[PDB]
């Protein structure tokens, strides 16, 4: 009494699948397999996934469904002292869609650019080209491929910008794509999960339809088996490497979505006695299984490029947007029926990001709706005000130096923001709130207590797991740079301010809460550490 509920369970699942499954399943995982010694990478990947990844993924989902509230009120009602964790998590997600939605617009921009027999990015003789343009990927920095120059010199116009200090002109074609995106988002998150739960049916499922088509097309290409070899051929030499275990841990952590309060929010609409343990296992698996599949879709085509198109595999095998917006489209253009693959590819990229933005924004709305009945009373006006703020500020990413803006936030939005956020999530739950209570809560929901395996992971493994990542992360730290450009010192600071903006809420809200409660210190802790339940 009283909360809206899912329209039935597929909606929830596809909402969680759609959230967790995004461009990151296509553009980092397959690369890591290739780099880390292939099928061997699965060992550290799976271990990290089992001990670190799923237990944390499991945690938020159970926590969300149990406390029946958004991120802020949820931690407020769990550990009032740490209620800042809710605030931090929410505005981390708040920062993230100032940038992340630009990837979708890029996807939409290639989509409409792709409505022709002759794909613009296949040729070096165009107006935006330079004398250094190769037909395909090479080793040398100064000579870009054709697909690269289309992306940078035409779509992005990143060549006009000398850094983050010069953003240059606003591309209004790019701005139209961002707006179309927020439109799609709006009428999605329009009425809440009663609609949003419906729309994810397309956005979550569609990627698999296209993955199948590209899986079949790619494997029928000459050289496709050569690609799979680079992808999956095991070197267990890597298993002994620290960098390989760190890549496994990190990838597993960031691929599943804990720390944005999205799983918390989404699960909060579940029926109390719903089995969230079966949902957490099914959903986790599908997320990973998707990455594994997509790997074949990519490296199948990657091998084809090395075989038929004469390019060194190390040059075409890459991560980040470069893979999806340059390397892969370069291959599609050489194939017969190119236009078809192109159109469905870029729509896949779109639908891959969309259901992700849904959960991200939903984390904020649900969080604020439960804290402030004012904006709970009017949903339609709030999201309009939120997305308007997004779009206006997002005009910065539609500029000629937009990528420089994108790359800054990408690094600092939460890299370490969410890490320390989830670390305090694992600590608050397992120690402060206690595992005994937590297990008791889950039992009352699904009927049985968590296996003591999960309990150990939440208390010990997770914290050192997040620590293992955060330590090795700081150990290899180097100042922000993109390509040959090095970001200024003031820019790096602005990132740390964005990164620490969210995390600072935890200690801050603890102080303001500590000082707002009368009595002795030891008496003042106990009041703030006593759950809403008790």
């Amino acid at each position, epitope marked *: 009494d009283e909360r809206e509920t899912w329209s039935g369970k597929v909606d929830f699942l596809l909402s969680v699948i759609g959230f967790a499954v995004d461009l990151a399943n296509v553009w980092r995982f397959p690369y890591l397999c290739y780099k880390n010694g292939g099928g061997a990478f699965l060992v550290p990947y799976g271990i990290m996934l089992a001990v670190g990844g799923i237990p944390l993924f499991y945690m938020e989902l159970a926590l969300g469904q149990h406390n029946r509230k958004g991120a802020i009120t949820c931690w407020g009602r769990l550990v009032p002292l740490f209620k800042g964790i809710g605030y931090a998590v929410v505005l981390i997600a708040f920062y993230v869609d100032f940038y992340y939605n630009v990837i979708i617009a890029w996807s939409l921009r290639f989509f409409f650019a792709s409505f022709t027999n002759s794909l613009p990015w296949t040729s070096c003789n165009n107006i935006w080209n330079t004398p250094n343009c190769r037909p395909f990927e090479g080793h040398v920095e100064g000579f870009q491929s054709a697909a690269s120059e289309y992306f940078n010199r035409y779509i992005l116009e990143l060549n006009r910008s000398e850094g983050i200090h010069d953003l240059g002109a606003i591309k209004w074609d790019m701005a139209l794509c961002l707006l179309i995106v927020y439109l799609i988002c709006y009428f999605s998150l329009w009425k809440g999960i009663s609609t949003s739960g419906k729309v994810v049916w397309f956005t979550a499922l569609f990627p698999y339809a296209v993955l199948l088509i590209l899986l079949i097309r790619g494997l029928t290409l000459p050289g496709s088996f050569l690609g799979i070899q680079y992808y999956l051929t095991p070197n267990f030499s890597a298993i002994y490497k620290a960098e390989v275990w760190v890549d496994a841990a990190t990838q597993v952590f960031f691929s599943l979505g804990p720390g944005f309060g999205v799983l918390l929010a989404y699960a909060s609409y579940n029926k109390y006695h719903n089995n969230v343990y079966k949902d957490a296992l099914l959903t986790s698996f599908i997320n990973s299984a998707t990455s594994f599949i997509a790997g074949f879709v990519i490296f199948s085509v990657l091998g084809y490029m090395a075989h038929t198109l004469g390019v060194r595999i190390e040059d075409v095998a890459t991560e980040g947007p470069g893979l999806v917006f340059v390397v892969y489209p370069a291959a599609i253009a050489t194939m017969p029926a190119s236009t078809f693959w192109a159109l469905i590819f870029f729509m896949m990229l779109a639908t891959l990001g969309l259901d992700s933005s849904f959960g991200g924004s939903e984390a904020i709305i649900t969080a604020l709706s439960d804290e402030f009945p004012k904006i709970k009373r009017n949903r339609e006006l709030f999201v309009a005000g939120l997305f308007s703020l997004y779009f206006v500020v997002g005009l910065a990413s539609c500029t000629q130096g937009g990528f420089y803006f994108f790359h800054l936030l990408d690094r600092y939005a939460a890299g370490y923001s969410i890490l320390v956020a989830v670390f305090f999530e694992a600590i608050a739950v397992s120690w402060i709130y206690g595992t*005994n*209570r937590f*297990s008791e809560d889950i*039992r*009352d929901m699904i009927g*049985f*207590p968590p296996g003591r395996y999960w309990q150990v992971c939440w208390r010990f493994v997770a914290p050192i797991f997040l620590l293992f990542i955060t330590v090795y992360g700081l150990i290899g730290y180097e100042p922000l740079t993109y390509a040959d450009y090095v970001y200024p010192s003031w820019a790096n600071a602005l990132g740390w301010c964005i990164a620490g903006s969210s995390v600072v809420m935890i200690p801050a809200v603890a102080i303001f809460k500590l000082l707002s409660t009368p009595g002795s210190l030891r008496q003042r802790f106990t009041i703030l550490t006593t759950p809403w*339940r008790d």
Partner: antibody, heavy 119, light 109 residues
Framework: EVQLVESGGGLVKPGGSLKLSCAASGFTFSSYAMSWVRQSPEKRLEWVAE????????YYSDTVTGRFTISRDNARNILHLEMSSLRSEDTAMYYC????????????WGQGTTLTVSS | ENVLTQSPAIMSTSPGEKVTMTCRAS???????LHWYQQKSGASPKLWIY???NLASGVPARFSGSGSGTSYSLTISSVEAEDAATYYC?????????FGSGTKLEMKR
């Protein structure tokens, strides 16, 4: 191995009140939920109330609700059922039954303790 | 409440014969939540079958159980005199928890 001993209980007059206890041993008691199940002289089993591991979740049957109160001592490993305004249809043998998992059921029962409510 | 009715109420069997008991619920019960208990005369109940198909520890394999929805059953393939008792089913599906009216198994001679 695992033992559950019900104690207290006996003759009580209608409207009267009484306290039943269950001594748990052989397992970590705090880790398992406990319920009181009773059996009338007509040999009918009726679940009375359930209490959680930490006693933070309590369920009562509609017959005993408002009268019976189930409590838990995890320090001394004792289960309690506090009865009040006892009626004559409350006459039965009261069982201390353990189970944590609903999909499992009650995997251990005590020897029972007999309550007789008569004037 | 969810009312579990059992039949027959009393049942007589010659050792070695095959016996079957039925448990019917007024409302659908999760297959995973239906359990059986054996109670010998003058003794307390013992968990016998849990989650419909699962024998508790120390339960001879001559016992089996099956069912779903509103209909469940307990079956003894070859009956032994040590099986003479009263068998109660139970639903842990939802509160209040409920026990079946019971089936009393007696030996024929």
């Amino acid at each position: 191995e695992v033992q559950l001993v019900e104690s207290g209980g006996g003759l009580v007059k209608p409207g009267g009140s009484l306290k039943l206890s269950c001594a748990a041993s052989g397992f970590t008691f705090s880790s398992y939920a406990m319920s009181w199940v009773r059996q009338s002289p007509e040999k009918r089993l009726e679940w009375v109330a359930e209490i959680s591991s930490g006693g933070r979740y309590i369920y009562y049957s509609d017959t005993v609700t408002g009268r019976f109160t189930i409590s838990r001592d995890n320090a001394r490993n004792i289960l309690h059922l506090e009865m009040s305004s006892l009626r004559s249809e409350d006459t039965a043998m009261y069982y201390c039954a353990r189970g944590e998992v609903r999909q499992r059921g009650f995997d251990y029962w005590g020897q029972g303790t007999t309550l007789t409510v008569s004037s | 409440e969810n009312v579990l009715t059992q039949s027959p109420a009393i049942m007589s069997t010659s050792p070695g014969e095959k016996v079957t008991m039925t448990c019917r619920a007024s409302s659908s019960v999760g297959s995973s939540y239906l359990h059986w208990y054996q109670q010998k005369s003058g003794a307390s109940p013992k968990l016998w079958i849990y989650s419909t198909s699962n024998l508790a520890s120390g339960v001879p394999a001559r016992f089996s159980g099956s069912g779903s929805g509103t209909s469940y059953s307990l079956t003894i393939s070859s009956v032994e005199a040590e099986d003479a008792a009263t068998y109660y089913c139970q639903q842990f599906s939802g509160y209040p928890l409920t026990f079946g009216s019971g089936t009393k198994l007696e030996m024929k001679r």
